[PDB]
């Protein structure tokens, strides 16, 4: 057992049938010492008597809300949650898989630039009875500063028959260094709680490899001369590090109607020359140059 | 809103057995669990066993382990107890209720309850 936040406490229940669970000890933060009794929530049933209680966790039943009474007034609360773990596997229900890019990622962060601001986002299908916290740091030993925001609904669609509700964080180095090489990892840790259930995730990156530059800015067309092909221009986004002769990008530009294999094309120039057919649609991402981050999402204009 | 219908239930003689049903009209997250809770006359619904859709190890009471089993059927959708060597002091209102805090053995935790059927157990 260990104290989470004032006056709420974990406990590890490694659970499978005929289990014992953990024998956990209660005491009433009280001067007196005699006349106390014991209940579990909203329940009057008293439980036992004493300045101290000692109850056997072993479910979701065992947890929640145990207060100590004298004199018919409250005392003292105590909040015991779950981390509930079952064959060497902690829960992981409350948060969904969201299997990019790797599986078992909870939690899926990206920054649009080297500025050191980064953003994280995560997946879960309850409504009520959800608190999320949300701290974060460079390195694990030493380890710099790192604040981040409040997690806060930012969308809402379907999953089927259940609604899929999507959180997320701004997150600030405290003092960032775009330009350098980094040698400790970011760690971004997130606890949930959902009822008596408690859980956490973890994530450990570098910012070159959860970078995602928006996409082109002003992508535009124009005719050529005579045979059916246009020139494709297009502009750096603003939210992409700055001076663009240091923060260089790569572009993919393809043509797509609708096995369009081919028709991709790449180069470090912010313009192109493509041929298009009815219907059809060229479309634009950027990337990193010098190191193979993510790719933005596409910029089309139809042809 | 999830609805569960019990069925199954009836008038048996000592020693009988029934197989209760619980048939859901679907389930509030993935790793929802079903549990039987037994009302005997006089006292209050006291957990039997719970099961989750997703499977793994169900979580039954102290003693109806051997007596009792619960198994579901994700297909169909239903959640069964099977009852066998039935005494007298199983007459009781066999309910069936939702939880998101598998296992579970208190009632407080459980979202949605069905209505129950009745049980009785004559010598």
């Known amino acids: 057992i260990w104290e989470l936040k004032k006056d709420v406490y974990v406990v590890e229940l490694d659970w499978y049938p005929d289990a014992p669970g953990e024998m956990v000890v209660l005491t009433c933060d009280t001067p007196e010492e005699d006349g106390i009794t014991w209940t579990l929530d909203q329940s009057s049933e008293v439980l036992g008597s004493g300045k101290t209680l000692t109850i056997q966790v072993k479910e979701f039943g065992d947890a929640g809300q145990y207060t100590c009474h004298k004199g018919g007034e409250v005392l003292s609360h105590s909040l015991l949650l779950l981390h509930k773990k079952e064959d060497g596997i902690w829960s992981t229900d409350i948060l969904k898989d969201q299997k990019e890019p790797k599986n078992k990622t909870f939690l899926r962060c990206e920054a649009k630039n080297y500025s050191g601001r980064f953003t994280c986002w995560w997946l879960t299908t309850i409504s009520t009875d959800l608190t999320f916290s949300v701290k974060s740091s460079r390195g694990s030993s030493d380890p710099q500063g790192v604040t981040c925001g409040a997690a806060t609904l930012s969308a809402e669609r379907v999953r089927g028959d259940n609604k899929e509700y999507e959180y997320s964080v701004e997150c600030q180095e405290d003092s960032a260094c775009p330009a350098a090489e980094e040698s400790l990892p970011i760690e971004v840790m997130v606890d949930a709680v959902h009822k008596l259930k408690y859980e956490n995730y973890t994530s450990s990156f570098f910012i070159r490899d959860i970078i995602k530059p928006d996409p082109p800015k002003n992508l535009q067309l124009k005719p050529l001369k005579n045979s059916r092909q246009v020139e494709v221009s297009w502009e750096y986004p603003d939210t992409w590090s700055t001076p663009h002769s240091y923060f260089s990008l790569t572009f993919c530009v393809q043509v797509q109607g609708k096995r369009e294999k081919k028709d991709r094309v790449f180069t470090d120039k912010t313009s192109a020359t493509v041929i298009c057919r009815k219907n059809a649609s060229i479309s634009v991402r950027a990337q990193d140059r010098y190191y193979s981050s993510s790719w933005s999402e596409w910029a089309s204009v139809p042809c | 809103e999830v609805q569960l219908v019990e069925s199954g239930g009836g008038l048996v003689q000592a020693g009988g057995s029934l197989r209760l049903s619980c048939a859901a009209s679907?389930?509030?997250?993935?790793?929802?669990?079903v549990g039987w809770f037994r009302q005997a006359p006089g006292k209050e619904r006291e957990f039997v066993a719970a099961?989750?859709?997703?499977?793994?190890?169900?979580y039954y009471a102290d003693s109806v382990k051997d007596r009792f089993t619960i198994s579901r059927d994700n297909a169909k959708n239903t959640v069964y107890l099977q009852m066998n060597s039935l005494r007298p002091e199983d007459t009781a209102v066999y309910l069936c209720?939702?939880?998101?805090?598998?296992?579970?053995?208190?009632?407080?935790?459980?979202?949605?309850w069905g209505q129950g059927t009745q049980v009785t157990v004559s010598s």
């Open positions: 209720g939702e939880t998101s805090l598998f296992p579970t053995s208190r009632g407080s935790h459980y979202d949605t």
């Open positions: 099961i989750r859709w997703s499977g793994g190890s169900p």
């Open positions: 679907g389930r509030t997250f993935s790793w929802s669990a």
